[PDB]
Assembly symmetry: D2
Homo-oligomer: 494 residues x 4
């Protein structure tokens, strides 16, 4: 059931958010925000820089001080605030989904039914952990009483990507706040709008001032200022592996701040001859085409056993030829635009290498429309491991299909990459499902499905697809700092 | 009870250890190892470089492959191997302590009674975790069965310091092996000898070849090769904050390998007027003077409430004037040398800044002897927060004592540093012990004691004193990589 | 004789200049330009970035191609264009000086009589070199005819400082164009306006399109894009030593582009007992106070022989107390503001270290007015070599005076710095003038004067005050690339 | 006429040379030096490191002090010392050529007749410049007397390659010493021996102590110590473009030391249809095959007009098939080994890409012998611009031959590279020789010859083949620092 907003969307919040008030940039400058489906400017937003990241950090530091309201309130009350924030987002679900769809080029049905549901559910999940973060008492050698505190780390810098602006904002602030941190958030330059609306709801919910600060701006200026800042205790980043390496270097050079990264992928699927073919086709399809291919976990290499390869390719091409391109706000439209020109260019470039290096083009392979950053859904068969479209993250609607005959070999081929975010295995055989998923060097392995992500389980990459995990019980460890307290006593007893 | 070796020590193992065999360096070169108490060359050891770090990593990678003996053996058998290795070290306790004492300038009583006991106990602790590392089953939304595997990460590069060579070797390899990793270890250039003996025992114990590789050599060559290597999954390092920043940058630039660091400190003690004065004096003393001040956790800033300050200083100076300097192998000797000339120079330099910047010199303040890197135990009173001896890690036998009158102020002063490894609080008041230890930005806080370290509890720094934790249940998390497996099912039931 | 503009200044040129046309920024953004005497915004200018630096470089590259008008025109015609440009600047002298004075906080008398005269004279000087740049014929061994061509290098990136915007623009483009290069100029963010007016005159004079491109914007964005650009053959920069090191690193990492730097100073004067005291006082005064101390060559350490030290200090303080602070456009005003807040802050910070570290404050030492970045002219006597005000470039109206008794010693003290831009020697003795000036590690040494700079002689630093020389016959070498052509012949004759 | 040494060579000088005395390394370590034709160790040499580079620099700095013998001696006497050093090298010509041939794998006829003749001639050339380095007197505006001093820069760090050890040592120290600098030289790790012999002759000739210091050792240790050293005024380096970028970055980060680089090439020849075909074949052949292809200026891309392409290829292959591989000390042998395994590997790797990417292999293409680093002389025809063997410097005996039909196009292809060291043009037409050589982006262009290098003319690269020039009148500018002295006078007269 898909309700819609019964009034044109008005853009209201466009300023820097620090200490629960709206700030103009120190420079005075603003920057444009565009709608990727029309290339039209939607509004202008205040441009944060080093100078503004400093006001946000001083505020975050102040709200983190011993004796402050955020440090002294019950953990259950931190949880309460988070639940309240989720209720408010549920209240503004129609406007946030529309804003998300219009700003981020995201199908409104997905924005409303998937993105907003996931934001609300993940916040509610995080809220429940707040008063269940516990340390330990430990039977140390000698006459001592030893316990641990799982304290918040402190001021956390959090850099949000443009592909899932609201979801990723909540994946970041949810755990960080549940554990008792304060945050300085830099949403993507392309997609700052939904974050600023959420900021208004953070103020409404009653979070103490300085606990969440949101500084829209550019990666090279505001993002660099975060990663190199001397009083930021931790940085979290989701984005390309390329920028991830710069983040990790900047932390090193500056103050050795803790770093977690969720980066790109070139995630493989392995489809065995005994698999339910239609199920494998459908999940692998959605796996690569979801949100215009703009997912870190895109199933961008599909290995299919030789004897069912032809039939897999046929059914796959058939599914890809059913899309309807257009503005993501209109019902019936099933493929929106790419986010922007850089991405658009990179994708078209990569599609050309495919054709040129000699992959079989099954459909698509060019742009679409007179306005927007639209790419036709594209399928390549007979792709080989040396081709650019098998090595590089495309981040576009471009599916690679490959054959294999030997299982040992295809696992080595699946693993033969610096990436390692996710993978898929399709088979009816118990032993193969368990042994293959154990052998894949990937952070999440799906068996007979793909792209199943939930707040209850940890998510992150092996190798250069990331450091650390988000969500689940695990993700909450990355947002605490462990302190051991050891007290001399006259005599211990077990 | 202090038994000794009834024969002169012979140096036996001096080569690179890869695949359970002894290798000459690829270059052919060797480097000298000296005895810091006599400045005499003890032997020559094979010098590992990039080219040799590569042979060690290829071996570690091979031993980590799916289907290998180390990957397929029962976790309980990994535990068994570790227990066996501890029994062997217990068997060679006399020779290892002597080697440690002679190579590292460490008092033989401490080497035998503390270092060797700690190595054996910590290995036995780690051995017991091997088959108790568990993942989770998770009640994800939707019709799915989801579980996690806590897999080993892979090839771990581990860089050991010179101050506690054997203990730190075991803190590194214990957890790493218990979790199922393979390792490439680079002991300190000053102190490679005990590591190479342990390597012989790793072979005797029956570890599969390639599971532990030990490559002696230099930081700038062998250490840099580890930190920048493209097929090393994680690096662990203990040493200075300065080198720690280079390690973290190199990981960033190369392959985004995971990084844990245990770095320096400028650890404070706060002594309240109600404290047991003699107990506080004794622990603070040992806190700074242990092993010639060459401890990351040195209690190098001691803040004492004004009304008991004079009496604390008097008793402290009294204790410091009781040492007997000499070769650490002779009974009755209670202070050995510094490790080497660089450290010796840095310490004497820093002692001069004290005198010059106008701290009150209470005893010591110069070198000792005609041979060795000996520094007189040194105490400064009326030290202030701006002095070099209050800001910089000395890593030498040099105690700083300071007064305070206001508790709020002294906590801010304690916290006013980029370091954050440890701290001490001395008081009889429950509320003060709990509230002060909560307010200190330090990884371990001792109450009415100092320097109490055990395998059962996690150890690591806040801020620039480190990233991550070692030992305890916690340390074992840093040596696993979490994989989520999500399986489509027809219907789930709770 | 000081004529003035008989109409209010209107700001006309505010856009990016590429191929002799005005361009909006690719982003669409603009940035404010302020008047430092009132803190009022004067106008907004188009903000160039990487994306716009690329349009400028492609244009510069195209105008440099073999067969193009700029490459094929007579060298004498390049000279003609430069003379014409000087005539045009002479025509617009009143408006350019006013614009300079208003935008850069520069006394109008100096702007009109010194800056504009220097621009015109230096351009005319450079114009005369164009057809007098010659290579060589060389009597190589063997039967060959060998000659050299002194070709232009190619596309030169030139980054202009804010202290002398027009003068430095001409010091850069004059030689570069005379030698036949094409340029991409990034004026200072504070002072882009006069450059854009000159650009209009470059178009009027008839330079081929693409020979001069001017891209206003920020150092970290537009300046970094220049220094790291892959198709820029050379970068010239005047500014702080700090940024200079980044420029030189960026050139290294990118394309090994040639680099010339004119950086800061901490320039000394040595005043001997036999000097003409009044002359030494007057030149040393102007030496440090010229343009609010905002000169790379500021005489910021004045060493005066003990027996005339007191009298030198008295006369110096007397001269410093005669200033009249105010807006630089009003006659009678003799000290304008500092350029901006960062500089203002740094200066006030440094003045405090003086007082605190215990220099004798003779006058000044605080801000002035309710608007503007005004600092009172400040004099310190009894300054010593360890003080911050003796080691750091202040770049403000702050004079340091020091005593000496031994000539050997004071030369070592003069030289005891990483800087080395300039120095002054005041004496009546021939031998002392020659021997002292030979012994000073400085690029320009004045004898019985200071701050005498002319187009005919080379200007640049020793040590960390710069690499290379500007102006004179010398400066023209830094803008050519030497090609040797060796032709096989049957028989050579002398 | 080829005389030989009438006794087996004995290796005599193997230590670090500082202040005209022989020093053991501070570490105590030595490193092996091998004979590339037999893989046999020739001797061991003292290994210099940071710690030893510091002793060399302190010595160089002391010898450069005002009032020292090297600073105060007549320039003509610096010249005299250099002439004397050349006479001594002429005296030891037989032993130096043998040492060169044995250590560097260089044909003895070439070592004796070319390398040693070039060393002696270039030193004699440099000696004659010493008292002919002059500054200027300059007609500055105003009443001033202005002159310039062309002073030595100071301590120059000089890093010598392994391909022409003695020649390049003299190209570096000749100009540097003639201008009055002091030097710290780091010969290649492969080829330190001839440098150390020359050092003995520098002492014999009577150079003041500290004027030349020679520190054998490794690039990553001794070479890095030079490039990053804080009291070294300039660094000169010849080697790969890759290391060149590190040198230039290190200078930037450290002390902004001046930098000159002579780096790799991928130098083209253009052979027009009207050329003397046999002459073009012979020079292009020697151009690529000289010293086993181990020349920066290797003619590694030969473009031949279509109508004479086949005949050029035939004649070229014919010439390449006439070599005799073996130890370079035996008469009749015409091709020695490659310098070492790394180079050997890189060359064989690159030869494989040729075959694989589909160039026509005309002869060679594999290794030779059971000992040594020998590669068969290799010729490829029908090479195209995208192939690895057309883009990458091979530095081995591997000739690339390509066709062209359009002159405009082939000049663009010649220029379409980041390299730019040299080029060759073969034609009988005056206009084509002049216009083509003007259009080539190369530092040296030969017409109807190749590889003609002499002390009288400047040598260096455009683009990423280097910064600056060596030899000729020009090279001497890179070893001076210009000081302007401006003296106030009552009245000037022309
Ligand atoms: C990493 C994430 C944002 C991917 C988005 N996504 C969703 C919806 N998504 C948002 C709410 C999330 C939450 N609960 O927070 C649950 C997951 N569905 C997907 C995908 C997907 O990337 N791919 C490849 C898919 O195939 N499908 C089906
Ligand atoms: C970090 C560590 C190596 C410090 C060494 N240490 C020990 C003995 N040590 C070795 C075995 C370790 C184990 N169980 O692994 C237990 C701890 N005792 C100490 C200290 C100490 O540094 N300081 C400051 C002290 O005051 N005391 C008393
Ligand atoms: Cl477009
Ligand atoms: Cl478009
Ligand atoms: Cl000593
Ligand atoms: Cl000593
Ligand atoms: Cl202000
Ligand atoms: Cl102000
Ligand atoms: Cl070999
Ligand atoms: Cl071989
Ligand atoms: Yb952009
Ligand atoms: Yb378009
Ligand atoms: Yb050392
Ligand atoms: Yb000594
Ligand atoms: Yb600014
Ligand atoms: Yb103000
Ligand atoms: Yb090597
Ligand atoms: Yb071999």
């Amino acid at each position: 059931d898909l309700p819609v907003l019964l009034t044109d969307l008005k853009i209201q919040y466009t300023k820097i958010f620090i200490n629960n008030e709206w700030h103009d940039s120190v420079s005075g400058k603003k920057f444009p925000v565009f709608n990727p489906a029309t290339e039209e400017e939607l509004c202008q937003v205040e441009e944060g820089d080093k100078e503004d990241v400093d006001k946000a950090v001083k505020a975050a530091r102040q709200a983190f001080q011993i004796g402050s309201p955020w440090r002294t309130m019950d953990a259950s009350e931190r949880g309460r605030l988070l639940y309240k924030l989720a209720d408010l987002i549920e209240r503004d679900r129609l406007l946030l989904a529309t804003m998300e769809s219009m700003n981020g080029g995201k199908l409104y049905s997905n924005a409303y039914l998937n993105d907003l549901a996931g934001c609300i559910k993940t916040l509610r999940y995080c809220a429940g952990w707040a008063d269940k973060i516990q340390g330990r008492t430990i039977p140390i050698d000698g006459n001592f009483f030893t316990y641990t505190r799982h304290e918040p780390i402190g001021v956390c810098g959090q850099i949000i990507p443009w592909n899932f602006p609201l979801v990723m904002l909540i994946w970041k602030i949810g755990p960080a706040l549940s554990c008792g941190n304060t945050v300085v958030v830099k949403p993507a330059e392309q997609t700052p709008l939904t974050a600023l609306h959420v900021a208004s709801l953070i103020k409404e919910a009653g979070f103490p001032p300085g606990v969440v600060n949101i500084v829209p701006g550019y990666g090279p200026t505001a993002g660099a200022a975060i990663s190199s800042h001397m009083d930021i205790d931790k940085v979290a980043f989701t984005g390309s592996t390329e920028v991830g390496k710069l983040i990790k270097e900047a932390a090193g050079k500056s103050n050795l701040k803790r770093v977690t990264l969720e980066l790109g992928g070139k995630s493989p699927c392995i489809v065995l001859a005994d698999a339910d073919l239609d199920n494998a086709v459908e999940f692998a399809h959605h796996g690569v085409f979801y949100h215009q291919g703009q997912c870190c976990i895109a199933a961008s290499r599909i290995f299919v056993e030789e004897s069912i390869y032809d039939e897999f390719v046929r059914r796959s091409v058939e599914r890809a030829k059913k899309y309807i391109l257009g503005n993501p706000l209109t019902p019936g439209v099933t493929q929106g635009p790419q986010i922007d020109k850089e991405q658009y260019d990179k994708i078209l470039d990569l599609i050309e290498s495919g054709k040129k290096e000699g992959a079989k083009l099954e459909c698509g392979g060019g742009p679409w429309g007179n306005k927007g950053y639209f790419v036709q859904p594209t399928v390549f068969s007979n792709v080989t491991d040396e081709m650019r479209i098998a090595k590089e993250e495309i981040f576009g609607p471009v599916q690679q299909i490959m054959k294999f005959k030997s299982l040992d070999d295809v696992i080595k081929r699946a693993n033969n990459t610096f990436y390692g975010l996710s993978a898929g295995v399709f088979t009816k055989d118990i032993d193969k499902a368990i042994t293959i998923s154990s052998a894949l060097q990937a952070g999440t392995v799906w068996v007979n499905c793909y792209g199943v992500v939930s707040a209850q389980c940890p998510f992150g990459g092996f190798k250069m697809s990331g450091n650390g995990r988000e969500l689940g019980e695990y993700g909450f460890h990355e947002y605490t700092e462990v302190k051991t307290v050891t007290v001399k006593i006259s005599q211990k007893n077990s």
